[PDB]
Design an enzyme around this catalytic site. Structure first.
Site, PDB file in Angstrom:
ATOM      1  N   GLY A  91       0.811  -1.204   0.000  1.00 15.35           N
ATOM      2  CA  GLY A  91       0.000   0.000   0.000  1.00 15.35           C
ATOM      3  C   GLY A  91       0.846   1.255   0.000  1.00 15.35           C
TER       4      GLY A  91
ATOM      5  CG  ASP B  15       6.794  13.778  -0.295  1.00 18.05           C
ATOM      6  OD1 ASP B  15       6.049  14.442   0.455  1.00 18.05           O
ATOM      7  OD2 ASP B  15       6.398  12.791  -0.951  1.00 18.05           O
TER       8      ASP B  15
HETATM    9  O1  LIG Z   1       8.795   5.250  -4.101  1.00 19.19           O
HETATM   10  C1  LIG Z   1       9.808   4.761  -3.532  1.00 19.19           C
HETATM   11  O2  LIG Z   1      10.941   5.307  -3.638  1.00 19.19           O
HETATM   12  C2  LIG Z   1       9.665   3.537  -2.699  1.00 19.19           C
HETATM   13  C3  LIG Z   1      10.792   2.830  -2.310  1.00 19.19           C
HETATM   14  C4  LIG Z   1      10.657   1.697  -1.521  1.00 19.19           C
HETATM   15  C5  LIG Z   1       9.392   1.267  -1.142  1.00 19.19           C
HETATM   16  C6  LIG Z   1       9.173   0.074  -0.283  1.00 19.19           C
HETATM   17  O3  LIG Z   1       7.987  -0.009   0.276  1.00 19.19           O
HETATM   18  C7  LIG Z   1       7.621  -1.019   1.090  1.00 19.19           C
HETATM   19  C8  LIG Z   1       6.309  -1.012   1.636  1.00 19.19           C
HETATM   20 CL1  LIG Z   1       5.244   0.281   1.223  1.00 19.19          CL
HETATM   21  C9  LIG Z   1       5.902  -2.037   2.475  1.00 19.19           C
HETATM   22  C10 LIG Z   1       6.788  -3.072   2.787  1.00 19.19           C
HETATM   23 CL2  LIG Z   1       6.282  -4.348   3.836  1.00 19.19          CL
HETATM   24  C11 LIG Z   1       8.078  -3.077   2.254  1.00 19.19           C
HETATM   25  C12 LIG Z   1       8.485  -2.021   1.390  1.00 19.19           C
HETATM   26  C13 LIG Z   1       9.824  -1.995   0.821  1.00 19.19           C
HETATM   27  O4  LIG Z   1      10.728  -2.986   1.088  1.00 19.19           O
HETATM   28  C14 LIG Z   1      10.149  -0.900  -0.040  1.00 19.19           C
HETATM   29  O5  LIG Z   1      11.399  -0.847  -0.596  1.00 19.19           O
HETATM   30  C15 LIG Z   1       8.270   1.984  -1.531  1.00 19.19           C
HETATM   31  C16 LIG Z   1       8.404   3.119  -2.312  1.00 19.19           C
END
Ligand SMILES: O=C(O)c1ccc(-c2oc3c(Cl)cc(Cl)cc3c(=O)c2O)cc1
Ligand SMILES: [Cl-]
Length: 332
Positions: free
Chosen positions: A45, A155
């Site tokens: 999410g 952000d």
């Molecule tokens: O936009 C970005 O730069 C960006 C980068 C990384 C993540 C990222 O999100 C996660 C989320 Cl939401 C839940 C869980 Cl359980 C694990 C992760 C994860 O391991 C992860 O790398 C989300 C967005």
């Protein structure tokens, strides 16, 4: 006349001292791998618009996360990719693993390391005083690193801070709004998220710098120790400044606008009113008293300032006595 100039107190000219290739992201050319190499496993999410998925790298069977890039200008895709690659290996910066496209849709996507995140809403309710100091210090390491690399995140907010609470691991994510800092450059003020927008954004002062991220960080510290989340809960961008002024005071707001010759949108005068600067002690009650120490208030007071140039830098913040319990001795 126009607004008065402003410069970052730290890391101001670091990008001009680097090769142009470092900050000239429009000239960056990513290499787009095949997204088929990463089998999607589950959706994670990240809001009603951004699509983020957990996946398995079939080459080595490692856990990764895939972020499909929303239909945005290629210029902004190049900016985010270049910034992530300039920051790779930095302390508590999310590691960009790969840049891929789907063979059919041709849609660009970013591959990140996996971190077993727990959402901040349930995490903030159980954090101890030491947890707050520890994770704020770890976040400050990421902000001081990216600032020293001439980059504003723009952000900072709890949603963009992944925390593996069992491993005590933190990553700063979502660099899609980050930009390179150049002295005297005027930036877009429609950045960050409403609750974490600094006053400079709300009053439309474009010559801001790394200190914007330090305001956002101060908002997070305030919501953690006071347990009012978000701390400044505006109903819109206009009301957001009123929520700030009800705490920091209106006379101090006008003193800030006068110093930088900032023209105030006259609609603010319809909703601002007159408000004294409140003592930070006024926000203490029985439900948060165990988290609000004298050094916590002193640090918060030095972060949540109208004047972006007077706020603590990430490094000055790390040297504040509030983090003495978590400052570890040098290893080896
Ligand atoms: O936009 C970005 O730069 C960006 C980068 C990384 C993540 C990222 O999100 C996660 C989320 Cl939401 C839940 C869980 Cl359980 C694990 C992760 C994860 O391991 C992860 O790398 C989300 C967005
Ligand atoms: Cl890469």
């Amino acid at each position: 006349g126009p607004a008065a100039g402003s410069r970052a107190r730290v890391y101001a000219e670091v990008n001009s001292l680097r090769s142009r290739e470092y900050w000239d992201y429009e000239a960056h050319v990513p290499s787009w791998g095949n997204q088929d190499g990463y089998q999607l496993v589950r959706k994670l999410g990240r809001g009603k618009y951004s699509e983020v998925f957990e996946a398995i790298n079939i080459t080595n069977n490692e856990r990764v996360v895939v972020k499909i890039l929303k239909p945005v200008k290629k210029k902004k895709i190049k900016r985010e990719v270049k910034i992530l690659e300039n920051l790779r290996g930095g302390t508590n910066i999310i590691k960009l693993i790969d840049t891929v496209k789907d063979p059919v849709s041709k849609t660009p996507a970013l591959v990140f390391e996996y971190i077993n995140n727990t959402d901040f809403k349930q995490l903030y309710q159980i954090l101890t005083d030491f947890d707050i100091r520890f994770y704020m210090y770890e976040l400050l390491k990421a902000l001081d690193y990216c600032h020293s690399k001439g980059i504003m995140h723009r952000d900072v907010k709890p949603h963009n801070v992944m925390i593996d609470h069992q491993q005590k691991k933190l990553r700063l994510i979502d660099w899609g709004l980050a930009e390179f800092y150049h002295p005297a450059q005027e930036y877009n003020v429609r950045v960050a998220s409403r609750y974490f927008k600094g006053p400079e954004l709300l009053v439309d002062y474009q010559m801001y710098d790394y200190s914007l991220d330090m305001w956002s960080l101060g908002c997070m510290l305030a919501s953690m120790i006071f347990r009012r989340e978000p701390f400044f809960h505006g109903q819109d961008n206009y009301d957001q400044l009123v929520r700030i002024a009800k705490v920091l005071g209106t006379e101090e707001l006008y003193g800030y606008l006068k110093k930088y010759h900032i023209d105030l949108d006259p609609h603010f005068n319809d909703i601002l009113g007159q408000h004294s600067r409140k003592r930070w002690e006024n926000f203490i009650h029985s439900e948060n008293r165990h988290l609000v120490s004298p050094e916590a208030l002193d640090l918060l007071d030095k972060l949540l300032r109208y004047d972006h140039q007077q706020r603590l830098t990430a490094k000055e913040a790390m040297e504040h006595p509030y983090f003495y319990p978590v400052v570890k001795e040098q290893s080896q």
